[PDB]
Design an enzyme around this catalytic site. Sequence first.
Site, PDB file in Angstrom:
ATOM      1  CE  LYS A 179      -4.202  -2.213   1.573  1.00 56.72           C
ATOM      2  NZ  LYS A 179      -3.590  -3.555   1.830  1.00 56.72           N
ATOM      3  CB  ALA A 182       0.648   5.624   1.114  1.00 51.77           C
ATOM      4  CB  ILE A 226       7.195  12.161  -1.223  1.00 49.86           C
ATOM      5  CG1 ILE A 226       8.504  11.541  -0.726  1.00 49.86           C
ATOM      6  CG2 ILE A 226       6.521  12.930  -0.091  1.00 49.86           C
ATOM      7  CD1 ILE A 226       9.576  12.569  -0.362  1.00 49.86           C
ATOM      8  N   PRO A 227       6.953  10.955  -4.109  1.00 56.04           N
ATOM      9  CG  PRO A 227       6.312  12.180  -5.983  1.00 56.04           C
ATOM     10  CD  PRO A 227       6.449  12.287  -4.490  1.00 56.04           C
ATOM     11  CB  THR A 235       9.905   7.944  -0.165  1.00 59.93           C
ATOM     12  OG1 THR A 235      10.764   8.936   0.427  1.00 59.93           O
ATOM     13  CG2 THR A 235       9.799   6.724   0.757  1.00 59.93           C
ATOM     14  N   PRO A 246     -11.202  -8.789  -2.879  1.00 58.94           N
ATOM     15  CG  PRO A 246     -11.003  -7.808  -0.774  1.00 58.94           C
ATOM     16  CD  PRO A 246     -11.035  -7.471  -2.248  1.00 58.94           C
ATOM     17  N   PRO A 267     -17.068 -14.897  -3.439  1.00 56.89           N
ATOM     18  CG  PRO A 267     -15.161 -16.224  -3.167  1.00 56.89           C
ATOM     19  CD  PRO A 267     -16.489 -15.899  -2.525  1.00 56.89           C
ATOM     20  N   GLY A 268     -18.365 -15.501  -5.765  1.00 60.21           N
ATOM     21  CA  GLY A 268     -19.287 -15.698  -6.870  1.00 60.21           C
ATOM     22  C   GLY A 268     -19.713 -14.408  -7.539  1.00 60.21           C
TER      23      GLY A 268
END
Lengths: 212, 212
Positions: free
Chosen positions: B68, B70, B72-73, B75, B176, B178-179
Site C-alpha cells: 500500500k 503511500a 512522496i514520489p 520515496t 477480496p 467470490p461468486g
Amino acid sequence: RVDVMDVMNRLILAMDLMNRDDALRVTGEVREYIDTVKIGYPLVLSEGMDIIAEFRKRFGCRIIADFKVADIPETNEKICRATFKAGADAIIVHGFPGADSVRACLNVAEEMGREVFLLTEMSHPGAEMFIQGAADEIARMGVDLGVKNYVGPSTRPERLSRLREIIGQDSFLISPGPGETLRFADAAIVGRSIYLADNPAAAAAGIIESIK
Amino acid sequence: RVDVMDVMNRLILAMDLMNRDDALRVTGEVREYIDTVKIGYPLVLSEGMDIIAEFRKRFGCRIIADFKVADIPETNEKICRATFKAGADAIIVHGFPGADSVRACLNVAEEMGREVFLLTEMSHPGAEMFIQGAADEIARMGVDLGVKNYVGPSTRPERLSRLREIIGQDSFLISPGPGETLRFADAAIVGRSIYLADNPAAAAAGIIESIK
C-alpha cells in the site's frame, strides 16, 4: 511540555539512505547533535528490520519508523506490533484510511508503551488532489482521538499554523526543515542537507547554530 | 485479455501469517490450485524481504507485494525498487497521495519490467471518512495514466461494477472474496478461509469448485 517527547536540539535526522554502512556512519557522526532518527522503508526493506535495533544499540537514539501505515485495522495492528518488537520508539501512520485504522495503531502503542504519530498532510505536488483537502479533518480526527503526536508539512508555514491551531499548543508536532518551521513545530526533520554533506557533523552543527 | 496477467483459477492467496514456517507450509499445500500469492508487511517485516525470493524459488508463484505504497514520489521510487529487487512481480500502491506518487511507481515498474496495482478503495469501517469519496476519482486518475491493474473492495459488489465501469473491461481487477466478485473482478483474493483451515489444500479446492 512534560508528557511529550524531548527531541535533542529540536532536530530529527531523516535517514533515507538505503545502505546500512552509509546509514550507520552518518548517524554516528551526528549523535552528539541529534538523538532522534527517522527511518523509512527504503532502508529497512533493503537491510532488514534488525537495523533498528542496531541504531539503538550503537547510538542510543530514539527511532521513529516512518512507515506511513495505511492498511485495514487488523493489518495495521500487525505492522505496528512487528515494528515495535523490532525496537521502534514511534511509528508514523496515515489518517486518510480513517479512525479505526488509526485506533488499531494506538491500541498496540498502548499495549507496548510506544508512540504513534498521525500524518495530517504531505507537501509533494500530487498532495493537492486528495490529501490537502482532508488534512484539517484528519487533524481533528486525531485530536478527537487523543492523538498526541503529529507530522505536518513545512513547505507551507501557514498550513503548520492552521495545524498547530487545530491540535493545540499541548500537542507534539514535527515537520520538515528553519526559523519559521520551529515557530509552529516542536522539531524539524532534516535529511539530505546532513546525510549527503561531505561533513555531516559540521552540517548538523551548522543547522543548530541557525536554530540558535 | 493477453496483456494482463493470468492468475491460476482466478484465486489469489492472501498470505497474511507472520511466521515463515507457517506461511511456506500453507502456500506449498495450495500450489496445485493457486499460482499467485499476495504478501504484506506483517510477513516481510517479521521475517525479512528475503522471504519473497523464498516463495518464488520454492513454489514458482507470482508474488504481489501488498505494501500500500503511500509516500512522496522519491520515496515511492526507492520502496518499489527495493521491493522489485527482492523479486516481487507486482506492488500495490495507494492512489490517495496523488498522480505523481503513483507515476513514480509506474516509472520503476517500467525500468524493471514489473507491475503496479492501484488501490482504488478499501472496505473497512473507517474508509467512509475519506477513501470512499475519493475512490471514483482515484480510479479515473489511474485510467488517465494508463494503469492497467487495480484493487477494489468486494464488501460492496455494486462498487465493483462502478469501478469496472470506470477502468473498462480491458483493465485487470482484483478484489477480496467470490461468486458475485468474479462477475466484475478478474481474480478474487482469499485469506483466512485458506490459511487458517485445518486442510488448506482442501479449502482451496473447495473454493474453486464453487467458482466452477
